[PDB]
Design a protein around this nucleic acid. Structure first.
Lengths: 37, 143, 262, 100, 206
RNA sequence: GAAACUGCGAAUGGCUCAUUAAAUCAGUUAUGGUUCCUUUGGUCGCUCGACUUGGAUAACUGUGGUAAUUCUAGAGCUAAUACAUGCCGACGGGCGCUGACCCCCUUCGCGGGGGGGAUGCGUGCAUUUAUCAGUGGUGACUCUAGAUAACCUCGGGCCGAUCGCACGCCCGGCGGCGACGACCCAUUCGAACGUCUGCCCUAUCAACUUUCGAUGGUAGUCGCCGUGCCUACCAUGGUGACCACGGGUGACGGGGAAUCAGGGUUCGAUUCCGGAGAGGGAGCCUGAGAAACGGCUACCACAUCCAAGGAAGGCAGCAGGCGC
């Protein structure tokens, strides 16, 4: 159960942090836009 | 100048004997939109009960009084004036409740008559339960 | 006293149990459990007084000690067990399913559901907590811990759990334009759409809610439970749908129905 | 061996008190001459000294090394055991059995 | 027994309180451990909530941390020097939190020597006949010497610590209450603290 | 299925109002300053090092002492989820240091660049201390996680020598559903200590407090934690005509009760919430919870039975009796 639960969450969070990293490149693309619109 | 008492006065958070090759200061913003003052960030005193640079957390009530006496050390007596409403006679009566309050050595030049805001924290002494967060100098005092 | 109390006098008992004065001296002191003592409904009161299957305490004991009653898909043979807000009472032999949700007034409704709806429930999160090795934990309103939640769920969101597995299916995020039931105060059982949240650093945050008929009412954020996205309830609502029509309207509806009935 | 007797008032002899006179002790649990009523109780019980004096009603003896003669009361008969070993290990220990 | 409550003493003004109830249990008071220096002795105390609290009555070893370079070793306490609270607690040599004690310098010396490839303590001229210390200070392979020479770059200890090591007793401050947890965990005094305490004991010396 | 050992409950309920005048109590808030039986939901091969062990006791048989009581000593036997001691498994390796030894390239070469790497030590949660960095949350942490160096109380933290119905699955092998237990976390029932405001009459009570703590400061001791709670050394403070300090109360406080045009006056021991007490004071045992009295230990007052040595007491529980 520990093995399956840790595995499933590690997939979910990797997806969530990639959604937040598609936001991080949006944070970089926010700054390049901020300076050079 | 500091470390007058027997034991060594220091901020327990920071380490001051790092092997190398000025002392950094522990301080915190205390929330509720109160400004962490400059003598707290820059100064060189040691105070357990300073709400900015010490081990005490402000929670519960925030009150205001006017400074009455400043004779006992790192502590002041403020005087809180209000009106109590008797119902038989549709009139008020002028009452007062003066309370003991911890003044940090941060607030350097405070005179009597100053409108001192205080915040409730853990019992500091027998009669002391509040701590000075800001000071407003009495009307004028420019000259 | 010198320890925890065990008796509850019939007068000092929570009022929404609607207990009479002349039956007895004591009321069923609810056993400790997931819900609070003033915000619960003991299994004895629900079973004997509302449904009126049992007539007395002995009959309630006899009905439940045959392992017949099942609160949240788990069998409970305890008469004073606190069945609270968002529970799925599942009497198996009659083939009925009840969900405890606040009536339009400050009381619990005898609300029958379908067996397809009686397989999940709608839990509010109370705190999000980091474990012993970076294992995130939820703690819901009914004292139920779930570890490895969604990394998005935060401290006032609603989650939908499966009742056997005890794991999150969906969640409704706390923001404007979401259906919320009020679970405390004078506005107890009002269903409305969130209009504005007003932050009070140090005090309790107050949330303004709008009803379905343009009736607007506030309540402190402690007493709010989001049960829907937009205007869409995620469970079945009781007759009235948490409106609270005025005593003037409730008088008119009562006697007008009586006139037409005969 | 002499295993303690009773005073002429009925007060039993308690080991390791070192008197011929009689004394009041606070007898808690883990003490002889007292069994408690409530769990976590102590009681003032008067007990007679452990040393033997001219003032005693009984002395309780146990024979250590059996002599040469047949005493008409005791050694004449032999007592059968009321019970036998219950624990599996105690049965194995007594009857001298292997594991298989 | 000993009551630990506010209602037995005068008000903010100076009026006398009349006790509205007799002594309660939770207002408890047990005698002071007054932990001494001898062979290990700890007694257990059942406290409120049915938890355990260890009374160190005698204690000679403690887990001290020379935390300049992050080296902590279990060490043998020898005697107490100075105490800020009271002066008779040094005469009747009792451990209390924030005491000043002397500790065995040998585990710290050993570590420093075996780490930095230099000697510590060891006064000038004294012959190192045992020569297992020889093998700890000499005989390195090829690139390990690159590691130990980029290490011993910043091997320089301060003078006031060198003095104590040469004698064989370091000054340390007890950071754990010995009466409550049944321990004597502390830290070695360094720099500003050490100068302050050496001065305070020399004013006590006269 | 008697008894008896074990676990649990006996701290709730019931009775009374003697104390008690910023005390109790009521409304409002705080614990980011704590403890928590039980209930409920989590955790319970995360630790690299036995097909079931140990020796007593009760009941029971037997022999007794005392004028005496829920008093008990001695003998012989026998259980455990009582009391103790302790494995194997998972387990094959990871992970941080330690570092023998080895191949490769740039410089003729020293030198310079990494790659592996025998061996030894260490490891998990909890406990205590010191140092370093900055997964999630708050108005605010010296928070919750993560890293490192150690420690581990022998009056001992955990890491199942326990019980019941089911009975199975292939060459002696071979799994569900429950009860009980257990460190830690949350939850519930709470308790405890603080915040702001509020009480009857009295000046024939005007000054009060303080080196035997009165108000602060530093360091500890004790405590479940915050604090003069208590020590040591400093400082001279704190309260008062806005009535302190002292005294009286035929005073437990409040929800409330009778009276009332409107104001108001008087009452509230009394069934619900809170407090206090078990003849008067003090001390403690066991337990998650008591300074417990239908628990114990004394001392004052009263008092019962005595074969004269000793022994047992506590109705402001329900009845009931004297006294008033």
């Amino acid at each position: 159960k520990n093995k399956e639960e840790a595995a499933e969450y590690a997939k979910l969070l990797a997806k969530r942090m990639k959604e937040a990293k598609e936001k991080r490149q949006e944070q970089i693309a926010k700054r390049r836009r901020l300076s050079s619109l | 100048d500091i470390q007058t008492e027997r034991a060594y006065q220091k901020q327990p958070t920071i380490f001051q004997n790092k092997k190398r090759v000025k002392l950094p200061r522990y301080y915190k913003n205390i929330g509720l939109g109160f400004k962490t003052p400059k003598e707290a960030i820059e100064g060189t005193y040691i105070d357990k009960k300073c709400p900015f640079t010490g081990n005490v957390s402000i929670r519960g009530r925030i009150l205001s009084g006017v400074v009455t006496k400043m004779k006992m050390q790192r502590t002041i007596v403020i005087r809180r004036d209000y009106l109590h409403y008797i119902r038989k006679y549709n009139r008020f009566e002028k009452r007062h409740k003066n309370m003991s309050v911890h003044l940090s050595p941060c607030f350097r030049d405070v005179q009597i008559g100053d409108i001192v805001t205080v915040g409730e924290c853990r019992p500091l002494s027998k009669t002391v339960r509040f701590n000075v967060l800001k000071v407003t100098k009495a009307a004028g005092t420019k000259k | 006293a010198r320890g925890p109390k065990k008796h509850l006098k019939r007068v000092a008992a929570p009022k929404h149990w609607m207990l009479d004065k002349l039956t007895g001296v004591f009321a069923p002191r609810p056993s400790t459990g997931p819900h609070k003592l003033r915000e619960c409904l003991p299994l004895i009161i629900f079973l004997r007084n509302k449904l009126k299957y049992a007539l007395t305490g002995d009959e309630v004991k006899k009905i439940c000690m045959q392992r017949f009653i099942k609160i949240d898909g788990k069998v409970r043979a305890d008469i004073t067990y606190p069945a609270g807000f968002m529970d799925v009472i599942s009497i198996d032999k009659t083939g009925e399913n009840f969900r405890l949700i606040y009536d339009t007034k400050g009381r619990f409704a005898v609300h029958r559901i379908t067996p397809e709806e009686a397989k999940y429930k709608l839990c509010k999160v109370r705190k999000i907590f980091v474990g012993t090795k970076g294992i995130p934990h939820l703690v819901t309103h009914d004292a139920r811990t779930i570890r490895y939640p969604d990394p998005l769920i935060k401290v006032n969101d609603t989650i939908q759990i499966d009742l056997e597995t005890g794991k999150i299916t969906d969640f409704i995020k706390f923001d404007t334009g979401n259906l919320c039931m009020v679970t405390g105060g004078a506005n107890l059982g009002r269903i409305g759409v969130i209009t504005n949240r007003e932050r009070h650093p140090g005090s309790f945050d107050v949330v303004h809610v709008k009803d379905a008929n343009g009736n607007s009412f506030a309540t402190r954020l402690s007493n709010i439970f989001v049960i829907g996205k937009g205007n869409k309830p995620w469970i079945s609502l009781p007759r009235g749908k948490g409106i609270r029509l005025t005593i003037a309207e409730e008088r008119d509806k009562r006697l007008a129905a009586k006139q037409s009935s005969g | 061996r002499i295993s303690g007797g009773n005073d002429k008032q009925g007060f039993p002899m308690k080991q390791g008190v070192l008197t011929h006179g009689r004394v009041r002790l606070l007898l808690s649990k883990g003490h002889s001459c007292y069994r408690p009523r409530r769990t976590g109780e102590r009681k003032r019980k008067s007990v007679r000294g452990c040393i033997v004096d001219a003032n005693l009603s009984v002395l309780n003896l146990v024979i250590v090394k059996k002599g040469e003669k047949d005493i008409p009361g005791l050694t004449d008969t032999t007592v059968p055991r009321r019970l036998g070993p219950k624990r599996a290990s105690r049965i194995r220990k007594l009857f001298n059995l292997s594991k298989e | 027994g000993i009551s630990r409550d506010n209602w037995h003493k005068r008000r903010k003004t100076g009026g006398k309180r009349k006790p509205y109830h007799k002594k309660r249990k939770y207002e408890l008071g047990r005698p002071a451990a007054n932990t001494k220096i001898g062979p290990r002795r700890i007694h257990t105390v059942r406290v409120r909530g049915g938890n355990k609290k260890y009374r160190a009555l005698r204690l000679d070893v403690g887990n001290f941390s020379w935390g300049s370079e992050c080296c902590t070793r279990k060490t043998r306490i020898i005697d107490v020097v100075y105490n800020a609270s009271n002066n008779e607690l040094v005469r009747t040599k009792t451990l209390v939190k924030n005491c000043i004690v002397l500790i065995d310098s040998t585990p710290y010396r050993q570590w420093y020597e075996s780490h930095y490839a230099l000697p510590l303590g060891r006064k000038k001229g004294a012959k190192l006949t045992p020569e297992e210390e020889e093998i700890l200070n000499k005989k390195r392979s090829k690139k390990i010497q690159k590691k130990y020479d980029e290490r011993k770059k910043n091997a320089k200890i301060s003078s006031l610590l060198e003095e104590q090591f040469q004698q064989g007793k370091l000054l340390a401050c007890i950071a754990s209450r010995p009466g409550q947890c049944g321990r004597a965990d502390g830290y070695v005094l360094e720099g500003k603290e050490l100068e302050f305490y050496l001065r305070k004991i020399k004013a006590r010396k006269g």
